[PDB]
């Protein structure tokens, strides 16, 4: 298992514009297009990203392309983040995957707000971090996905994904 396969399971794959769990226009593998309530604005954002007049639909190759870009950007953002980087550096490979999954989902900002959990993870207090992580809007809104990621940090294995 790896980050790509992990996120592919968490996000699914859709080739037509759809609304995410928060009601935002998205496409492909979790690629958020816009927070605006406007489908037009979303189709324009789509065309701008793909580089063609898509008409709200993309191919699988174009989806995988957006996905590669988004994964790379997430990692790169973590590495540029002074709050995140040190935590990320302290983790083992499996757990780094869980850290990227959270950023992919909620943004660097969203994550930066889990200050207490990050500090526990950095200290390798796995069980306590898992409990603290669960006390969040994230966990209450997307419980099954949160549980998988939390299990990952708790155990350092891919068990939740097998
Ligand atoms: C960097 C980015 C996201 C993260 N989530 C938990 C730890 C961590 C570190
Ligand atoms: Cl883009
Ligand atoms: Cl869920």
Short mmCIF file of N, CA, C and O in Angstrom, two decimals, residues 102-112:
data_model
loop_
_atom_site.label_atom_id
_atom_site.label_comp_id
_atom_site.label_asym_id
_atom_site.label_seq_id
_atom_site.Cartn_x
_atom_site.Cartn_y
_atom_site.Cartn_z
N UNK A 102 -4.43 13.66 5.69
CA UNK A 102 -5.13 14.71 6.37
C UNK A 102 -4.99 16.05 5.63
O UNK A 102 -5.94 16.79 5.51
N UNK A 103 -3.79 16.38 5.16
CA UNK A 103 -3.57 17.65 4.44
C UNK A 103 -4.36 17.66 3.15
O UNK A 103 -5.00 18.64 2.80
N UNK A 104 -4.35 16.54 2.45
CA UNK A 104 -5.06 16.45 1.21
C UNK A 104 -6.54 16.75 1.42
O UNK A 104 -7.19 17.47 0.70
N UNK A 105 -7.06 16.23 2.49
CA UNK A 105 -8.44 16.41 2.78
C UNK A 105 -8.84 17.78 3.28
O UNK A 105 -9.86 18.32 2.88
N UNK A 106 -8.10 18.30 4.23
CA UNK A 106 -8.47 19.52 4.91
C UNK A 106 -7.58 20.72 4.73
O UNK A 106 -7.84 21.78 5.26
N UNK A 107 -6.51 20.58 3.98
CA UNK A 107 -5.64 21.68 3.80
C UNK A 107 -4.73 21.87 5.01
O UNK A 107 -5.01 21.47 6.15
N UNK A 108 -3.65 22.52 4.70
CA UNK A 108 -2.57 22.80 5.62
C UNK A 108 -3.02 23.64 6.80
O UNK A 108 -2.53 23.54 7.94
N UNK A 109 -4.04 24.41 6.50
CA UNK A 109 -4.65 25.27 7.46
C UNK A 109 -5.49 24.50 8.44
O UNK A 109 -5.37 24.66 9.67
N UNK A 110 -6.36 23.69 7.85
CA UNK A 110 -7.23 22.85 8.61
C UNK A 110 -6.39 22.08 9.59
O UNK A 110 -6.71 22.05 10.77
N UNK A 111 -5.29 21.50 9.10
CA UNK A 111 -4.41 20.67 9.92
C UNK A 111 -3.66 21.41 11.00
O UNK A 111 -3.54 20.93 12.13
N UNK A 112 -3.17 22.58 10.64
CA UNK A 112 -2.43 23.45 11.53
C UNK A 112 -3.18 23.70 12.86
O UNK A 112 -2.58 23.99 13.91
#
